[PDB]
DNA sequence: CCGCCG
RNA sequence: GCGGCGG
């Protein structure tokens, strides 16, 4: 949801000894898929800082005991020499899509808000095939295949969705 | 608004004429002023 | 990703240096890179020698012109509003009739602008372009008579403009007419004046034309020779001295009027060939020996008698034939004004030759830089020809760097006469793109030049053709002059060839703009490539061959308004020039020689060539384009890499991987939605915004100046008379605003302070200041605030204090402050995008991936183009690109299809077939078959005639995919959409049309002081005009008050608008407008003058407006 | 006498000229620098045209809206705002007659 | 025609 | 004032 580099004031800047631009970077961070474990983890702030000749990968974030990064080899940046890169990336648990202009997170007066990509699924598809059991041939065999980044599991999702559905069904209770 | 400058002109000459009438009235002067005068009004 | 290209017409020679037109022009213009020794003496040097030997006896001669030390460097010129000019002097030496030749070895007389490596100039801080020009090539031609369908008239056109414009008409009822400046005189008269006697004349001239009887017409004036010279003077319309004032005759001799264009080719070309044959001197120029020689006048009439008579050749001149129109390269345009300056200078130096004391005059006395600077200066900064470089994106710049205009000096062509010129003429073939012209008024008048089209020695746009003797085609090419193209029979390049030999008996060719089927033995020349027929800009549309020319234009022009998207993607399907555009345009940075990479900073790339050298290439980080677009160079090379000569080191503003990219390739379904894609609406998937697919960075350059009033210098400090500290935060630096700060509408960008209500302190504001705090700073708050609309993030700041390093600070101007503000442009509802074929449209609704059209396999589409916009407009090309684009998705491969030679319908189905094994092949293995949904749409497909009844769903779907259509489930209902729908990867772009420029919403604000109007200009906006067109609109409606309201309550009735405002504040009913201040003001305006304008009652009586 | 139905253009009787007139401008005195206030019998004098201020008079005897149509006892100043100010006209008495260029050229 | 930028 | 550009 938000990031902050030490010598950068605006998102449209450039950091010495670093190929990628601030925007090429924050772009790559939204591709970062982290995974919390308990509600007590609403807003985590990962910290990372490496120098010199190296390739920053999402694995270089200093571990946070309760949350895990299933996105390890994601390329974050490349550093020539004297490439001083230190940054703090704010991460949250949310739902749906949210424009960096909608939330406007301000941990530090010089940090830049990023766009929210909460949906933990990339693609869903359902198929209806011919019958397996029964006394009639006109029947449905629904099998749906789901795809997740890693945060939660195909099943986890399915269930939550199933719940949300049910949850709404009940709203047909009190008339007026 | 510019019109005043012209308004001042007319006022001036019209006035200068009132005086140029009471002081003494040398013909050539009376007309040379009426002239300017007529031109101002325009 | 594999890159396959389907071209079968062997492209024989690589495209030329696209900016060559401008580049070389200036080179040959100011031959300033090589010693005074090298031959090329046109332009500068030529214009120099033209007017340098000054013979007032006074003798000042030219030696060498040298120049070269650029005051400052490129960017500095931009950062400081400096015009990037080189310094130019030249050795001159003045001789005397007495003993003595003082040579003042240097007089710097001017500062001429320079030419960037890209081809642009930097006049005052900004980059501009000198657009090329066209006109009737100063020569001689013969055009049919105006109304009289009978005979034709002769024209003799010489420029510059001051020189005469001669015509030769023949009206048998009494005269042979020669006109100069609108007056007619006996053609003979002048003839005699030259020596041509009735006898010799008529006999060699009147061999076959009785018309001659019209010349031997003088049995009275034709018997007096030199006296006719005097007789012709009488002819001049004004009373002057009979003798020597032959100046007017002197004028048509050898100097000023006729043209001093290069002896041999400039005019002489239109001589030798078109008429007569030899040119003594440069023009009908000769005042030598007292007697004159005009080897020109007689033949012009010699061809008149030929034309009107037999068939000496069919002399009828088609005006537009490029063989009679020249293009004015910058060099020529600039060199033009230069000699105009040379002349203006030589004007005063002759004056100072008589004012002369003695031998003591040389540099100073003879030379004054005044004329030449104002001259040149005027061109580059005042001429209606050099303008603001359209740099929406590189391509844009490049076109604007190469188009031709008709309007200009005015002598060439005007506005109200054009129906004839506007047409793409026969000759424009491979010389003027027939598609590059702009829509609306000014069409066909201003157009960009062709692919291979290159300007020759004297302007006629030459084009390349291939020689072919017998049934054999060469690899030898020749750039023909429009005229010379007609002599031969050229054939198309689509003509089948087995290698170096023609292929069919009946092969296409075009004689003289006429389509003719010719034989292998008759083909003398063949086209180089289809490309040459259009422009660069045009040459970018994928399947142009299937697109109506009319829409194709929209398509070409559109690309020029493309905007630099952060993530730049080259077209899934390209023409084959993308690489070059970026190349020849200078967006990307290439590697000079072979070698290895040293440093790959995000600011500079340092490489080590294998030749013992190591250079540092700084990357323009994030510069503000002329149009306000991001211009960064992102290195695409890693530390220590062996680079090939001419390899992309970094990508340009819109070029990635060395390819031109402007917008992105999105998956698109081509069908109708509720209505969100009604007329020309386009639907977009939230999913796009998510991966920052369409995002442009933008910059606005706000500026403020600390003026020097006689009331007290305006200071720029953190101090603001109105006491607020919360708004002073962002403005940390005393006076300036902090970089990285978030400026919103109404915030202070820069602070400034000037003196009170003009001259005197207010006697009413001296009592208010004294009550609460007499010691209140008498200075006022005049600060550069964030203009309503928006700002964003401050990213660069420029201040120019006292001790100016090398900047030209205007007078009165104490110091200047510039503030660059940026922001991110994410695609939103009001934004407008478009494809290379001409389908333009705005975003109607941003749909949640959730319920938008998805394919069997989870993959949703990105955009839905309404099908209905394809039939009326004729641009199949897009539907094609889409098909190929569909293979590209599942085949993961980009293709390159040439203009007329590109991919073909069979081959695409071939790759599509391959694509079915990827899309559906993984489907079979992954373990699942066909949906009951897929079956259902297949039923409606077979009953539709799309599939061949009787085959397996497998087979079926394949045949259905091949057509370019797949199945698609709603997404909202998950129910299929009865009937296959075509989908694919289509290359579409976002245009320089943010809605940022689209919503001035006004409530209340500023009024003009002299005239009562809600003009804007500050934190407040202007209210739209109502015009009478729009009043009538209201009138018809019978919208009385709605109209009354417009005229008074909303505008002029100061007091009225007041009552209204108040009323509305009270939730009351607006007051009744009594008299418009316009009514009352009229009464008075009419009282002020005689007329007693009196308003009346029912019964003719008084009434008071006042 | 309610609705304005007809408008008339007629020549101006000198008597009527003085009729619409309130005072006569007698001196080219626009505004003296020291005091933003107009000079005397100048172009911007307030008696000839009216009150330079909003609903108060020259010296301050009557300053509100309760006595709106009453003229002050010591100096003639009846007022509403600064706009009933821009509705009155003044005249200049010309020595020897001049003519309307409009009626002659 | 109406509109907007430099 | 002049160039450009949207419909």
Curated annotation (Swiss-Prot), chain A:
Keywords: DNA-directed RNA polymerase, Nucleotidyltransferase, Transcription, Transferase
Molecular function terms, GO-annotated: DNA binding; DNA-directed RNA polymerase activity; protein dimerization activity
Catalytic activity: RNA(n) + a ribonucleoside 5'-triphosphate = RNA(n+1) + diphosphate
GO cellular component, one term: DNA-directed RNA polymerase complex
Alpha N-terminal domain (alpha-NTD): annotated span: 1-176
Transmembrane segment boundaries: none
Cleaved signal peptide residues: none
EC category: transferase
Domain of life from the UniProt record: Bacteria
Record-level GO BP terms: DNA-templated transcription
Assigned EC number: 2.7.7.6
Family designation: Belongs to the RNA polymerase alpha chain family.
Domain notes: The N-terminal domain is essential for RNAP assembly and basal transcription, whereas the C-terminal domain is involved in interaction with transcriptional regulators and with upstream promoter elements.
Role noted for this protein: DNA-dependent RNA polymerase catalyzes the transcription of DNA into RNA using the four ribonucleoside triphosphates as substrates.
Complexes and interactors: Homodimer. The RNAP catalytic core consists of 2 alpha, 1 beta, 1 beta' and 1 omega subunit. When a sigma factor is associated with the core the holoenzyme is formed, which can initiate transcription.
Listed name of the protein: DNA-directed RNA polymerase subunit alpha
Organism: Thermus thermophilus (strain ATCC 27634 / DSM 579 / HB8)
Range within the parent protein: 54 to 229 of 315
Curated annotation (Swiss-Prot), chain C:
E.C. numbers: 2.7.7.6
InterPro entries for the chain: DNA-dir_RNA_pol_bsu_ext_1_sf, DNA-dir_RNA_pol_bsu_external_1, DNA-dir_RNA_pol_su2, DNA-dir_RNAP_su2_dom, DNA-dir_RNAP_su2_hyb_sf, RNA_pol_bsu_bac, RNA_pol_bsu_CS, RNA_pol_bsu_protrusion
Secretion signal span: none
Any GO BP: DNA-templated transcription
Cross-referenced SUPFAM superfamilies: beta and beta-prime subunits of DNA dependent RNA-polymerase
UniProtKB keywords: DNA-directed RNA polymerase, Nucleotidyltransferase, Transcription, Transferase
Superkingdom to which the source organism belongs: Bacteria
Swiss-Prot/TrEMBL catalytic activity: RNA(n) + a ribonucleoside 5'-triphosphate = RNA(n+1) + diphosphate
GO molecular function: DNA binding; DNA-directed RNA polymerase activity; ribonucleoside binding
Top EC class, one word: transferase
GO cellular component annotations of the record: DNA-directed RNA polymerase complex
Similarity-based family: Belongs to the RNA polymerase beta chain family.
HAMAP family xrefs: RNApol_bact_RpoB
Record note on quaternary structure: The RNAP catalytic core consists of 2 alpha, 1 beta, 1 beta' and 1 omega subunit. When a sigma factor is associated with the core the holoenzyme is formed, which can initiate transcription.
Function: DNA-dependent RNA polymerase catalyzes the transcription of DNA into RNA using the four ribonucleoside triphosphates as substrates.
Protein name (Swiss-Prot/TrEMBL): DNA-directed RNA polymerase subunit beta
Organism, scientific name: Thermus thermophilus (strain ATCC 27634 / DSM 579 / HB8)
Gene name as annotated: rpoB
From Swiss-Prot, chain D:
Binding sites annotated in the UniProt record for Zn(2+) 1: 57, 59, 72, 75
Taxonomy, superkingdom: Bacteria
Similarity comment: Belongs to the RNA polymerase beta' chain family.
Quaternary structure (record): The RNAP catalytic core consists of 2 alpha, 1 beta, 1 beta' and 1 omega subunit. When a sigma factor is associated with the core the holoenzyme is formed, which can initiate transcription.
Protein's job: DNA-dependent RNA polymerase catalyzes the transcription of DNA into RNA using the four ribonucleoside triphosphates as substrates.
Name assigned to this protein: DNA-directed RNA polymerase subunit beta'
Organism: Thermus thermophilus (strain ATCC 27634 / DSM 579 / HB8)
Classification of source organism: Bacteria, Thermotogati, Deinococcota, Deinococci, Thermales
Residues represented out of the complete protein: 2 to 106 of 1524
């Amino acid at each position: 949801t938000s990031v902050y580099i030490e010598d950068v004031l605006h998102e449209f800047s450039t950091i010495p000894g670093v190929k990628e631009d601030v925007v090429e970077i924050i772009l790559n961070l939204k591709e970062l898929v982290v995974r919390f474990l308990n509600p007590s983890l609403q807003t985590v702030t990962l910290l990372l800082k490496a120098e010199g000749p190296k390739e920053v990968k999402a694995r270089d974030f200093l571990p946070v005991a309760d949350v895990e990064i299933m996105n390890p080899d994601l390329h974050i940046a490349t550093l020539e020499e004297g490439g001083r890169l230190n940054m703090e990336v704010r991460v949250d648990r949310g739902v749906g899509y949210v424009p960096a202009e909608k939330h406007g997170i301000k941990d530090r007066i010089n940090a830049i808000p990023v766009d929210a990509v909460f949906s933990p699924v990339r693609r869903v598809a359902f198929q209806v095939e011919d019958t397996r059991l029964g006394q009639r041939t006109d029947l449905d065999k629904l099998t749906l295949r789901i795809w997740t980044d890693g945060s939660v599991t195909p099943l986890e999702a399915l269930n939550q969705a199933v719940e949300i559905l049910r949850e709404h069904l009940t709203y047909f209770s009190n008339p007026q | 608004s510019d019109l005043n400058d012209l308004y001042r002109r007319l006022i001036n000459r019209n006035n200068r004429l009132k005086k140029l009438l009471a002081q003494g009235a040398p013909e050539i002067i009376i007309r040379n002023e009426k002239r300017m005068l007529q031109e101002a009004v325009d | 990703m594999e890159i396959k290209r389907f071209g079968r017409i062997r492209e024989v020679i690589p495209l030329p240096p696209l900016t060559e037109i401008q580049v070389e022009s200036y080179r040959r213009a100011l031959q300033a890179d090589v010693p005074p020794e090298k031959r090329e003496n046109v332009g500068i040097q030529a214009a120099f020698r033209e007017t340098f030997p000054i013979e007032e006896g006074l003798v000042l001669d030219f030696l060498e012109y040298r120049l070269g030390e650029p005051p400052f460097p490129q960017d500095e010129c931009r950062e400081k509003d400096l015009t990037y000019q080189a310094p130019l002097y030249a050795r001159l030496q003045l001789i005397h009739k007495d003993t003595g030749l003082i040579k003042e070895d240097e007089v710097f007389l001017g500062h001429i602008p320079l030419m960037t490596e890209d081809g642009s100039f930097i006049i005052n801080g900004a980059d501009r372009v000198i657009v090329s020009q066209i006109h009737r090539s100063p020569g001689v031609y013969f055009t049919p008579d105006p109304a009289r369908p009978g005979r034709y008239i002769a024209s003799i056109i010489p420029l510059p403009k001051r020189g005469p414009w001669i015509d030769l008409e023949v009206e048998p009822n009494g005269v042979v007419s020669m006109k100069v400046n609108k007056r007619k005189f006996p053609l003979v008269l002048l003839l005699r004046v030259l020596g041509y006697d009735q006898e010799t004349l008529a006999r060699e001239l009147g061999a076959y034309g009785e018309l001659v009887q019209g010349l031997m017409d003088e049995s009275v004036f034709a018997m007096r020779p030199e006296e006719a010279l005097i007789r012709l003077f009488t002819l001049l319309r004004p009373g002057d001295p009979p003798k020597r004032d032959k100046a007017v005759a002197y004028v048509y001799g050898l100097i000023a009027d006729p043209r001093r264009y290069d002896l041999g080719e400039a005019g002489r070309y239109k001589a030798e060939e078109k008429l007569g044959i030899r040119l003594s001197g440069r023009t009908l120029a000769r005042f030598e020996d007292g007697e004159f020689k005009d080897e020109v006048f007689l033949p012009t009439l010699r061809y008149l008698f030929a034309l009107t008579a037999g068939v000496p050749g069919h002399e009828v001149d088609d005006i537009d034939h490029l063989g009679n129109r020249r293009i004015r390269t910058v060099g020529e345009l600039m060199t033009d004004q230069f000699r105009v300056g040379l002349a203006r200078l030589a004007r005063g130096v002759r004056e100072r030759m008589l004012m002369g004391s003695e031998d003591s005059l040389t540099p100073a006395k003879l030379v004054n830089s005044r004329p030449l600077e104002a001259a040149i200066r005027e061109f580059f900064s005042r001429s209606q020809l050099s303008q603001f470089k359209d740099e929406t994106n590189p391509l844009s710049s490049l076109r604007h760097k190469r188009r031709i205009s008709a309007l200009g000096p005015g002598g060439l062509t005007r506005e109200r006469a054009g129906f004839d010129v506007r047409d793409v003429h026969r000759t424009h073939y491979g010389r003027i793109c027939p598609v590059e012209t702009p829509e609306g008024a000014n069409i066909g008048l201003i157009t960009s030049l062709a692919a291979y089209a290159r300007v020759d020695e004297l302007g006629f746009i030459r084009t390349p053709y291939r020689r072919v003797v017998g049934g054999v085609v060469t690899d030898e090419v020749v750039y023909m002059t429009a005229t010379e193209e007609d002599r031969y029979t050229i054939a198309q390049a689509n003509t089948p060839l087995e290698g170096n030999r023609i292929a069919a008996e009946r092969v296409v060719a075009r004689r003289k703009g006429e389509p003719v089927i010719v034989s292998p033995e008759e083909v003398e020349f063949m086209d180089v490539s289809p490309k040459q027929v259009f422009s660069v800009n045009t040459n970018l549309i994928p399947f142009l061959e299937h697109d109506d020319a009319n829409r194709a234009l929209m398509g070409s022009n559109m690309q020029t308004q493309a905007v630099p998207l952060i993530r730049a993607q080259a077209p899934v399907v390209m023409t084959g020039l993308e690489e070059r555009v970026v190349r020849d345009s200078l967006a990307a940075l290439y590697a000079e020689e072979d070698g290895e990479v040293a440093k790959v900073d995000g600011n500079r790339i340092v490489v080590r060539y294998e030749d013992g050298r190591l250079v540092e290439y700084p990357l323009r980080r994030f510069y503000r384009s002329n149009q306000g677009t991001a211009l960064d160079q992102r290195p695409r090379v890693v530390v220590g890499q062996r680079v090939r000569k001419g390899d992309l080191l970094a990508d340009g503003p819109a070029s990635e991987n060395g390819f031109l990219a402007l917008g992105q390739n999105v998956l698109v379904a081509i069908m109708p939605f509720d209505g969100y894609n009604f007329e020309d609406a386009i639907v977009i998937s939230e999913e796009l915004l998510k991966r920052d697919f369409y995002t442009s960075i933008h910059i606005e350059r706000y500026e403020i100046e600390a003026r020097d009033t006689k009331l007290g210098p305006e200071r720029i400090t953190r101090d603001i008379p109105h006491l607020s500290e919360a708004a002073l935060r962002d403005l940390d630096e005393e006076g300036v605003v902090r970089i990285g700060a978030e400026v919103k509408p109404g915030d202070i960008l820069v602070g400034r302070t000037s003196f009170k209500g003009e001259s005197e302190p207010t006697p009413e504001e001296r009592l208010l200041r004294s009550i609460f705090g007499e010691k209140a700073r008498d200075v006022k708050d005049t600060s550069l605030r964030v203009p309503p609309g928006e700002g964003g993030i401050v990213v660069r700041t420029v201040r120019l204090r006292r001790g100016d390093p090398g900047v030209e600070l205007k007078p009165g101007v104490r110091e200047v402050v510039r503030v660059y503000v940026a922001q991110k442009r994410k695609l939103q509802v009001g934004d407008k995008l478009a494809n290379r074929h001409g389908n333009k449209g705005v975003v109607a609704k941003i749909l949640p991936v959730e319920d938008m059209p998805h394919l069997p396999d989870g993959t949703p589409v990105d955009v839905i183009l309404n099908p209905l916009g394809v039939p009326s407009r004729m641009n199949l090309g897009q539907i094609l690109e889409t098909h190929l684009g569909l293979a590209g998705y599942f085949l993961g491969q980009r293709y390159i299809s040439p203009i007329f030679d590109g991919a073909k319908e069979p081959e695409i189905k071939e790759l599509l077939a391959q694509a079915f094994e990827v899309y559906f092949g993984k489907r079979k293995g992954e373990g699942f078959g066909v949906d009951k949904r897929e079956v259902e749409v297949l039923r409606r497909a077979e009953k539709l005639g799309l599939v061949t009844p009787g085959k397996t769903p497998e087979e079926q779907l394949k045949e259905l995919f091949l057509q370019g259509k797949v199945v698609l489930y709603d997404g909202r209902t998950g129910e299929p959409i009865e009937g296959p729908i075509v989908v694919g990867q289509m290359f579409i772009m976002k245009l320089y049309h943010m809605v940022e420029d689209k919503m001035h919403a006004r409530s209340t604000g500023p009024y003009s002081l002299i005239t009562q109007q809600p003009l804007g200009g500050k934190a407040q906006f202007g209210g739209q005009r109502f015009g009478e067109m729009e009043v009538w609109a209201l009138e018809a409606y019978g919208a009385a008050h709605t109209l009354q309201e417009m005229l008074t309550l909303k505008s002029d009735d100061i007091e009225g608008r007041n009552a209204a405002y108040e009323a509305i504040i009270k939730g009351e009913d607006v007051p009744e407008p009594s008299v418009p201040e316009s009514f009352r003001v009229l009464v008075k305006e009419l009282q002020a003058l005689a007329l007693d304008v009196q308003t009346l009652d029912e019964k003719d009586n008084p009434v008071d407006i006042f | 006498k309610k609705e304005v139905r007809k408008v008339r253009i007629a020549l101006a009787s000198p008597e009527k000229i003085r009729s619409w007139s309130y005072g006569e401008v007698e001196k080219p005195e626009t505004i003296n620098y020291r005091t933003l206030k107009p000079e005397r019998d100048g172009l911007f004098d307030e008696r000839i045209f009216g009150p330079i201020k909003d609903y108060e008079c020259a010296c301050g005897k009557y300053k509100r809206q309760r006595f709106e149509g009453k003229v002050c006892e010591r100096c003639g100043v009846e007022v509403t705002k600064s706009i009933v100010r821009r509705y009155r006209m003044g005249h200049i008495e010309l020595a020897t007659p001049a003519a309307h260029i409009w009626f002659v050229k």
